[PDB]
Amino acid sequence: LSKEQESIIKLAENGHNIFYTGSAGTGKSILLREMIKVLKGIYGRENVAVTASTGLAACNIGGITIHSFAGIGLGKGDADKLYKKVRRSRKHLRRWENIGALVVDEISMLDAELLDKLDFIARKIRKNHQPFGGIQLIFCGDFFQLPPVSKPTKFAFESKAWKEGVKMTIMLQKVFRQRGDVKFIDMLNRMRLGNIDDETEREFKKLSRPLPDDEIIPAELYSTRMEVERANNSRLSKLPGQVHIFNAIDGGALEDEELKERLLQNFLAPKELHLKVGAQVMMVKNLDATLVNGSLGKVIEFMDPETYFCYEALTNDPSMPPEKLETWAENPSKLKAAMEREQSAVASRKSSVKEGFAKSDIGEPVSPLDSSVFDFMKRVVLENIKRKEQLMQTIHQNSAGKRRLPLVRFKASDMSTRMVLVEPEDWAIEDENEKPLVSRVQLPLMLAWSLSIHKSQGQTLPKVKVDLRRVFEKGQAYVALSRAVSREGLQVLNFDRTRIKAHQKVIDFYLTLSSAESAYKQLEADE
DNA sequence: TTTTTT
Numbered sequence: 001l002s003k004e005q006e007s008i009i010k011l012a013e014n015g016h017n018i019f020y021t022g023s024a025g026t027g028k029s030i031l032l033r034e035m036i037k038v039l040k041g042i043y044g045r046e047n048v049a050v051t052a053s054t055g056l057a058a059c060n061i062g063g064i065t066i067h068s069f070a071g072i073g074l075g076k077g078d079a080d081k082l083y084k085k086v087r088r089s090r091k092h093l094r095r096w097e098n099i100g101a102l103v104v105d106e107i108s109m110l111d112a113e114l115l116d117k118l119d120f121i122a123r124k125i126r127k128n129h130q131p132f133g134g135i136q137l138i139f140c141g142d143f144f145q146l147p148p149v150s151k152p153t154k155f156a157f158e159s160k161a162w163k164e165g166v167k168m169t170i171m172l173q174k175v176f177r178q179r180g181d182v183k184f185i186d187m188l189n190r191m192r193l194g195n196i197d198d199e200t201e202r203e204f205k206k207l208s209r210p211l212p213d214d215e216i217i218p219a220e221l222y223s224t225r226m227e228v229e230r231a232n233n234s235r236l237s238k239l240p241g242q243v244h245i246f247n248a249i250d251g252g253a254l255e256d257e258e259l260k261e262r263l264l265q266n267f268l269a270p271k272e273l274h275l276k277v278g279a280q281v282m283m284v285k286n287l288d289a290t291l292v293n294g295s296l297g298k299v300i301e302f303m304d305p306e307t308y309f310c311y312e313a314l315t316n317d318p319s320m321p322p323e324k325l326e327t328w329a330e331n332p333s334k335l336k337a338a339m340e341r342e343q344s345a346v347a348s349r350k351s352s353v354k355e356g357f358a359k360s361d362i363g364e365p366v367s368p369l370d371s372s373v374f375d376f377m378k379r380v381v382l383e384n385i386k387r388k389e390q391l392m393q394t395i396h397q398n399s400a401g402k403r404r405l406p407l408v409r410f411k412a413s414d415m416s417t418r419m420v421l422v423e424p425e426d427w428a429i430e431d432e433n434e435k436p437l438v439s440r441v442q443l444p445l446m447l448a449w450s451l452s453i454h455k456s457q458g459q460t461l462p463k464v465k466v467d468l469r470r471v472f473e474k475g476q477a478y479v480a481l482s483r484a485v486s487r488e489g490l491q492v493l494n495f496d497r498t499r500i501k502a503h504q505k506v507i508d509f510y511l512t513l514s515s516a517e518s519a520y521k522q523l524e525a526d527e
Numbered sequence: 528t529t530t531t532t533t
């Protein structure tokens with residue numbers, strides 16, 4: 001870690017409501033990841049609230065989406081009625097009564113209206129007038145990156161809540177991401193601000209040369225959902241291995257089918273989820289505390305719940321007597337007899353709707369499980385008790401004509417993994433008398449080789465294809481291209497400098513702030 | 528042409 005950075009953790013240590021920023025690449029998130037350790041040691045592991053604007057970027061540091069944390073849904077409604085939505089769910093209310101520090105990363109994507117609301121929700125809950133109820137704030141973004149989504153949106157700082165809230169500011173300088181290319185850093189420093197010359201243009205337009213043709217799948221960054229899907233399938237249908245179709249149950253009672261379709265998209269769920277063995281996926285609904293919107297991962301193989309109950313126990317003891325896997329692979333009546341022991345009335349009218357999802361293929365045969373699924377065991381001639389894989393594969397050949405679901409290896413930003421067999425979820429849009437106008441049961445997955453540029457903001461991409469065809473917001477081009485470590489590993493199609501421009505309030509804001517060294521002097525102000 | 532909801 002640098003010297004300019006440690007003066008921030010230690011500023012946040014001493015308890016100051018800092019916002020802190022810097023060019024893309026300057027290691028603000030990495031910094032934050034360690035800052036979060038030393039704020040749980042002050043308040044409590046359960047009293048620090050790690051969040052970001054999006055949900056993938058929120059996983060970059062360990063956190064849930066800011067909206068998921070506060071418990072405000074999409075947070076469109078009035079500032080007063082969000083308070084009563086919060087104080088209903090007991091979990092979310094005391095989550096606001098105990099947090100000592102609220103962390104928000106890539107706050108650039110939050111709009112002044114919500115920052116005003118959270119500020120209010122906290123004050124009326126915590127019984128305190130202080131700029132957020134006394135909650136130590138830590139805002140970490142870069143206002144030259146993507147601005148808050150509008151459907152006019154004032155920036156996070158135009159709010160009364162921000163300029164009341166932020167007590168202190170800092171500003172990092174050394175761009176670490178492209179550290180070995182002092183030229184490429186420069187090219188992005190002036191793409192961030194609005195200036196591009198010929199040598200920049202020609203160099204970027206030279207990057208459209210195809211990327212290396214090795215066995216590492218390059219990441220692709222398109223500005224739209226229907227590009228991201230074109231590339232997520234342009235790439236998936238190049239993967240060796242048998243596909244698995246996943247058809248989404250739909251309903252139920254709306255008449256305008258054009259909005260029905262459009263409603264059926266923003267659920268983040270596709271009508272046709274195609275998934276092979278080895279696809280990069282990303283959870284899209286907040287399921288639990290560590291499997292959330294934005295969790296990258298990979299698909300491992302496709303098993304039904306009877307099967308996966310063996311494979312799960314088989315991960316917890318590869319030194320297991322196989323006389324019990326053989327009791328399940330020669331009599332699968334006893335198989336259910338151990339699965340049930342470990343596990344509403346409107347949920348029983350959606351189980352039997354989710355029950356139909358991915359109908360059983362009693363006429364299609366069941367291919368064997370891959371090699372890599374039993375690699376975990378392969379780590380002394382008398383200990384080769386591995387009739388286990390032949391037992392496990394036998395248990396799989398008993399699940400033809402049974403719904404097989406994706407077993408996904410998920411990966412957190414602290415580098416630990418977690419396997420889960422992904423069950424369908426349900427997306428409904430309804431009214432006061434509960435009738436789902438549009439309802440859809442699909443898997444909470446989408447291919448995650450291509451992110452949007454919004455979702456990729458905050459990422460650090462080793463080999464990244466970028467296509468500036470359909471960018472429409474200031475700095476968005478600068479995000480997609482600055483997600484790159486180098487130039488040797490970067491493709492740039494349809495480079496268009498004729499719309500690469502700055503916003504005026506972003507120049508106006510980064511002239512009234514404290515530099516990296518104007519963070520040190522406030523340390524001897526404490527001491 | 529975008530994100531956000533257990």
Ligand SMILES: Nc1ncnc2c1ncn2[C@@H]1O[C@H](COP(=O)(O)OP(=O)(O)OP(O)(O)=S)[C@@H](O)[C@H]1O
Pocket residue numbers: 001002022023024025026027028029030031106141142145176177457458459460
């Ligand atoms: N002190 C450091 N020493 C070595 N590598 C660093 C250091 N700080 C950052 N990096 C590298 O820089 C990248 C991480 O920088 P980030 O923390 O992601 O900054 P940032 O996320 O680009 O800022 P954004 O995009 O505005 S959220 C990784 O490749 C790190 O290995």
Ligand SMILES: [Mg+2]
Pocket residue numbers: 028029030060457458459
């Ligand atoms: Mg980041």
